[PDB]
Amino acid sequence: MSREEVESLIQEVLEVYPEKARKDRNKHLAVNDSKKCIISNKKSQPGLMTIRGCAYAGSKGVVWGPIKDMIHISHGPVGCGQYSRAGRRNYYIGTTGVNAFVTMNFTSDFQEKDIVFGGDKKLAKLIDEVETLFPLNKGISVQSECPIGLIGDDIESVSKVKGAELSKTIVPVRCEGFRGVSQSLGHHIANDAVRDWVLGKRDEDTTFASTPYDVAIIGDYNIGGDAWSSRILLEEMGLRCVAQWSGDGSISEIELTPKVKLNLVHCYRSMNYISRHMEEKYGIPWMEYNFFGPTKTIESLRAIAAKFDESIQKKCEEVIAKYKPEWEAVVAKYRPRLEGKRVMLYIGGLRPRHVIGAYEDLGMEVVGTGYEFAHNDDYDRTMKEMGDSTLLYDDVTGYEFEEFVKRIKPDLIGSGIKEKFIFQKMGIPFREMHSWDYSGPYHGFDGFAIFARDMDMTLNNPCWKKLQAPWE
Amino acid sequence: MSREEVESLIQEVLEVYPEKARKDRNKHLAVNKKCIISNKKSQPGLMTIRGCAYAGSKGVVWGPIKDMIHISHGPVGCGQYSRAGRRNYYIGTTGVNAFVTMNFTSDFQEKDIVFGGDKKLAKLIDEVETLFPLNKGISVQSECPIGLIGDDIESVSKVKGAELSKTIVPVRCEGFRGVSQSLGHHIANDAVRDWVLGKRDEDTTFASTPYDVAIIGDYNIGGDAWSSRILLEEMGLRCVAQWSGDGSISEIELTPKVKLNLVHCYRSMNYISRHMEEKYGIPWMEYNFFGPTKTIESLRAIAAKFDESIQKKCEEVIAKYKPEWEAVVAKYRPRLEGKRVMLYIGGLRPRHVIGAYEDLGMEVVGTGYEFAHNDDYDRTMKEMGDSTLLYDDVTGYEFEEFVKRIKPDLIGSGIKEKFIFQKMGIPFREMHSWDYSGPYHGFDGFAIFARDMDMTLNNPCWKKLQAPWE
Amino acid sequence: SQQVDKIKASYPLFLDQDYKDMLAKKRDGFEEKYPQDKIDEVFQWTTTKEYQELNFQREALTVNPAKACQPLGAVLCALGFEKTMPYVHGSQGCVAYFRSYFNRHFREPVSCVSDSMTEDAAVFGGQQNMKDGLQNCKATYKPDMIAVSTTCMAEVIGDDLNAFINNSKKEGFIPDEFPVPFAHTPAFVGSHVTGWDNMFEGIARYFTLKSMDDKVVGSNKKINIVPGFETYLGNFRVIKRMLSEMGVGYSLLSDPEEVLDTPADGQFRMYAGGTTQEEMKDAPNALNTVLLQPWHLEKTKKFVEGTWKHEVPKLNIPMGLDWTDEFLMKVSEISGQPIPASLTKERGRLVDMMTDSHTWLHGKRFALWGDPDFVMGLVKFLLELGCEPVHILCHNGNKRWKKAVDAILAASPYGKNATVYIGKDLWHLRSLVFTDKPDFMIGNSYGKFIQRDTLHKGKEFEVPLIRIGFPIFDRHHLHRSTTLGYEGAMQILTTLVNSILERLDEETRGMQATDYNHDLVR
Amino acid sequence: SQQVDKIKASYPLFLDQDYKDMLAKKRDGFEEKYPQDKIDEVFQWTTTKEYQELNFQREALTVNPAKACQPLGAVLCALGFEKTMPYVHGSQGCVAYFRSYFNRHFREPVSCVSDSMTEDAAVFGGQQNMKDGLQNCKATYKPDMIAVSTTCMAEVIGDDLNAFINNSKKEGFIPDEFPVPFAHTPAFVGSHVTGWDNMFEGIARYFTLKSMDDKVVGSNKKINIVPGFETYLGNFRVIKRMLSEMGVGYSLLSDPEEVLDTPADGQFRMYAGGTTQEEMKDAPNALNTVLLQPWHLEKTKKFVEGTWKHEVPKLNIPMGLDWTDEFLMKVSEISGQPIPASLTKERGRLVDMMTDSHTWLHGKRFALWGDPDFVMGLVKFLLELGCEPVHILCHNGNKRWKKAVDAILAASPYGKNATVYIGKDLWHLRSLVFTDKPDFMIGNSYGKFIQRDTLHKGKEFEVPLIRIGFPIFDRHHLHRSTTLGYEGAMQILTTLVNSILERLDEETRGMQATDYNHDLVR
Ligand code: ICS
Ligand code: ICS
Ligand code: CLF
Ligand SMILES: [Fe+3]
Ligand SMILES: [Fe+3]
């Protein structure tokens, strides 16, 4: 570390690029010291092995897919729906194939006939087939893949007509992968789709009996149960969680959300659009919070409780007092085993800053972090969590990440599946920070225990001392 | 396939032997008193298929008794190789009230060889009682060294038995005794007589009926005894006991109260059957539940010993199962018709399964026993065809050379024979363990038997032995 | 709550009473969920033959397909060439999914790039992406070759790959002699295996088409081997092992075994092994070319026969006993090398295993699926084992393939109750294993949800899954296995018989109820 | 009854109502069975720590041992020599059991003779049995060598094998030049592995003791390998494989791999392969001798060092990562051959697999048993995997061995909850897995009865068995597997992780109960 040594690193790594790429990538790498440091949310340079996905991944994979009692159509060729089937652990309670459908792959399996004639009448026949074979579904979304927009199909027309014919909520989503620069625009497109086609359904219904403690978890996709480990705390504090967007979410939960008193935003990146909308149209305020680690979770519980009355603030301190011996035993056991270890992170749009406090609660240091698709308001929030002279990388290339790791030599890397086996072969412990490496939850006090044992089990695993044969 | 041809087969194979072995083995090979010798010592070094007297007593007769604990008394070997090797099926909670598939042993060390194992035996009886309180009796199955070192398991049994008010059975079935498993049967029968069978001689509280019967010599291989018992009770009889297959010590003790003993395995259980007729007046009869012809014949003969109501129910049972076994023959006989079988088993099945093969149109061209006596061969003469091959205590060499010439379509024998003939390209079925299938007794067993003979004889694997470039 | 000495992950954490009460309250309060009796009623209905009839009338809706798209197969093919970077011209979301899909199956790095065509390129084409993309890829990851395929957005907008690459070389973005073979791989035609055939034929033409005057069939004394879409490391290894044992000269064209199995020794290796460009240039000089998976190598066949003038032998995939026999005898005839004693012995040890295990395999009823060549080889071997392949499903199969399989079934009594399904998927197959229940499924990881569905009806209706195929995500290192040759047949047999015995052991483990048949010896 | 189109074997035939009623009638009428409440109460008692205390106080009673008797190992050792007939002097019932035991494990013929000593030979000795037995055996089965061990009957009565064999040659029953090595193998001393050591030492003495004056250590430039009691074909194969990769001249002394794996090609081969007599004669000329399983080759070690004058290296069984490394580095030092790139890569691929699977293996608790060398190598590898071998049972283990394993445990945090038991049996182990429940057992087929017992207590108490060891009777062809070297470590790794994952899939397969965690990807 030296700021001088980190900046020399960046210069050297960039010397492999042709000039046009070098000048662009230079703007996406920076050393930490609000705004005027790094740019983001720009197009990826071709041929450099970005880790980013597409808008369809951002709409179908993250926002809509988790909704459990709807059927989501991957509309287009057979590819996107198959590669994304059950790849994200957005957990749910249901009877799959009967009343819930999250881990299934529904698709229109486009053939050349569909590219030439169009897919709109196939979509209509497909909607009828869905209704006969899955009668308990409570709504249908149509997740456009790349060809739908290019060929001039009109899924809006099919949605309106079939929706009126069957008295069904059918949501057209133009999340074609060529739109935008990453999964980020997929969040936006999906947010607007919820707004235009689902969120207003009960605008004019007042049957729901509201309480002053009504709340909704916005932007928790329940990876490994994260949202369940968050809901339990909020409700132990005296709140009523009317909805969960989108982890373990039902359509009715979403339709009920305009009735709550406060919107709790975990993932700002994916859900800030719909939260700002509900503040404009319904007057519902929203606030950001962080349930990673005891420090942040306690800070969040007290900040949320301050929005209500003394009874909620009292129950807040009761919840804090209850779990205190639990997370203090976690720290006592695992912090000595992880103290002073250095971590490099590369994830999507929220976790590269949100988990830093949980690492610091175990005496670990985040010497580098970065996002696939974050915007500049995300980096603004990142300047504060990260220490000075740490390395920041937006839309890092495969080449850059390897070179950064070779020089910095972190004790642990936390990133995605496309990165995991690269760094394990270099002998650096790796934890998946998307899928939690099939573990978790990591949210809340119950999630911190799992987080801690997971970081320790991998960082201190005996396999890491064996990489080099004793004869070389 | 001609008296002359079998005759010269026999002399040809015998030319390999030294003269001593040659002269002996000529007496044990014959083409069907005056024909063959049996129940003699095995010639050294010729790879007999035979076991020992401990196998005959512990493995066969006593081991199946499910609510007793049987001690393999001696070194660790015998009890371990014999643990759960024979499929004598039973209903029980193993380790608390039933013990068949467990291995209890005194694990003789050199201290026990030099000083005797009798105090170790008494200590091990106390430990059995501490850790297995629901056992209803203990037997001590002697391995080779017990007699050789001069231990007195009888004294330990009588003393500990009286101390604990427990049935403790000393069995001197040391493997060096006799010439095969056969003497183990006799020793085991005599141990039942001397230490178990007479416990309730002065007991009059059992409620008898005119139809009380006992199944003697069925060890419930794969459920055999269960698929026989059901037929007998559908015929109106009451099966008080089953020896030793799924058998309990109380069933044994109640056997002297029955009206008729039904002997399946003559060789292993005739001794105790003779005794029960001598002492209790209970008559006994042999029967055969292999295949529909023999089962129908056996049912009618057993019913004839009783009254018209039993003989009425006999014909009802026969009429009930008629469509079932006739469906079996309709499906499987055309697939096995005219196929030739060679058998080599123990003391009963080498003759008893012949009628079942014939019910599927199959021809038994060779058969023989490990340890049969002359009275078994007398009964075999009537079951086997003319000019077929008989072999007593066949050697591994002889069996292979016989098969090379005869070229049977299927061989039925034991585990030490199976993989030899499979490699030679000849379908093989295990006729001890039923190849982990069965039951084969009764009507329900004939269905499985036919299915098993067909699946193996006609399996696609047998046409693939020769490489196409060879 | 957690006990720090025995931390609980999601299972069984959420079975704690407080989580169960919280989940119950969420459902009752806000989910407006159908009543459990209605859910049970609809589930039971989805197991009926009435539902199945409706299921098989589907024309527009696909549910749980058993196939992927073309460019996935193009990537795998390109990965098999030395120091080659697979490059998919089009939108970048595809490449993220391609790499992840293979990451999860091989548990290895998977290198592949995109040229990130976006909204603007739909109106004016992706020419500039290709120019900057090839140059950036070349300079950054330093491959010796870049093998270009397409995403469906670039197919729909009609980008001329050939011209874009030629212009990239004309304008100086990459050197003229730098190898850039290409193939159009439309996701809306065929499947992943078609992408493999298209990519391979494209690489073949690139190194051969304009150089044929120099070539003499047989002059290099080798036999070309084209593996096709192949995801078991053992299958590449077993082929090269048998041919070496015979002393046959060979060229394995597309060989990813090294890149998909690098050691963890402290360094990441982007490239390793693989077919050299020279082996491709010299392939027309082979005695002949053998197609290990002919039913998805049609385009390649026409090129090697039409341009290389090789007389490609009519050979099935070398799976099972008969087809491994025929493969080796064909290789022996072409090369003049005799089948050595070591392979004759190995054949006999497979036959020996068949005789040892035939009583447990006989009459066992299987539902299975996968790619066309794999499926027919599995069907063939099952019949050789005396098993019944009752439900045979190939989503990406065609009519001519189905005829071939049907004639294979008709040549055996063990095919009497079998039906071959093409164009059908795993939701169709779910119905078949309910209405005509088999004993096991042989398929990929997606099969696990069918087993779960069958178990919900009842333990006596559960159909256990046996994982053979692609992808396998929920077991570790099965990608190391072998399914070809005698070695692969020995592995399949052992897997099959022991799955049968493991299930039997489960069904007879009940104390005093079913453990009379809980045999120590089987 | 039977339906001719779906014939039921014992399971499930006897679950039919008429059989069920008949079995209840039998019990109630004549079995005088303890009531089910008393049976339940006694079972629950056998699961407690109070029962375990009484269980461990046993001195005289053994229940379900995990060992066999000496001559079993002598037979296996003898089988490893070219055209050698194993010959056990004593009673014939033993040989019937030895053959059947190995028959069921290997699913192969097992050829061995007896000289059928009976009552009358127990009073006057078996000298005539030896004379006729050797002459009959040589004439009938044409062995090149006859290797003689003993039955416990023959040991107790004190037959002098050397005298009887010498008298047999004196009196012309077999030629004086015919090799008849012998060893006394009393069943009441040690175990089956002791009989292997004794048989081997006896054979080594027969061929070298008289001839040492012309021998020069190192002159043939080979390394002798002594495998010990070994029931995995892959373990012989992997040692020869690695040594040939290194280019190391070697001699495997006792090699039954061919005789235990003959092809099924239409003929039975009584003998096949094996260590030649010429190789045993030349063995003192090797550079050194390596014992693959030193803890049951003590007698062999003393003869090799005291007579051949080889400085046998102190090496553990080559199991796991560290001890395979040490094996190869010692072989390199002795032979002067470098460890080749192919083995370095294979080591790296095993380490790669360890990194891929470490999160599911970490902290997994195991109860295990077997022979001393096998057990300590499984313990070693488990620690290398981050697993906890909490119950370590070795019925035929000794005090110095236990000391060695305890030190291995003390060197790792993953051994802090482990205990090594010697002289304990599988009824002792049943108590440990109830009172201190592990996640799995690693053991032979006798462990299936422990899993049944644990399941009877409850599904949450079941401890599944992973079959690694000897004998394995209830699955097919596991005797083909490998446990030594990197290849064996990769196989063990894969079996362990996937047993963990199969168990997880079962516990999360319940629809709407636990299948929130029924992940496609693991
Ligand atoms: S939605 Fe986003 S990439 Fe906020 S697209 Fe991505 S389940 Fe990441 S850093 Mo995968 S903006 Fe969620 C995310 Fe974060 S799929 Fe998950 S882990 S908190
Ligand atoms: S008892 Fe006998 S050898 Fe009669 S010792 Fe043997 S379970 Fe055999 S031919 Mo194994 S006299 Fe029974 C027998 Fe027959 S063990 Fe079984 S099959 S009908
Ligand atoms: S960006 Fe789908 S994988 Fe592609 S080649 Fe067409 S089917 Fe196949 Fe995003 S929406 Fe999907 S994932 Fe890509 S295509 Fe576009
Ligand atoms: Fe890997
Ligand atoms: Fe075999």
Give a brief outline of the structure:
The complex is a heterotetramer, with 2 copies of chain A and 2 copies of chain C (522 residues). Chain A is α/β, with parallel strands linked by helices and 472 residues long.
Task: Describe it.
With 472 residues, chain A is α/β, with parallel strands linked by helices. Chain A has 20 helices and 14 strands. Chain A has 3 domains: 189 residues, no CATH class; 143 residues, no CATH class; 115 residues, no CATH class. In chain A, 45% of the residues lie in helices and 13% in strands. Chain A starts with a helix and ends in a 13-residue tail after the last helix. Chain C has 522 residues and is an alpha/beta fold. Chain C has 4 domains: 146 residues, no CATH class; 105 residues, no CATH class; 83 residues, no CATH class; 106 residues, no CATH class. In chain C, the strands form 3 sheets. Chain C has a 5-stranded parallel β-sheet with strand order 10-9-8-11-12, sandwiched between helices. In chain C, helix 17 links the parallel strand 8 and strand 9. Chain C is globular and about 75 Å long. Chains in contact: A-C, A-D, B-C, B-D, C-D. At the A-D interface, helix 19 and helix 20 of A face helix 15 and helix 16 of D. Bound molecules: iron-sulfur-molybdenum cluster with interstitial carbon (ICS) (2 copies), FE(8)-S(7) cluster and fe (iii) ion (FE) (2 copies). FE(8)-S(7) cluster (CLF) sits at the interface of chains A and C. It is classed as oxidoreductase.
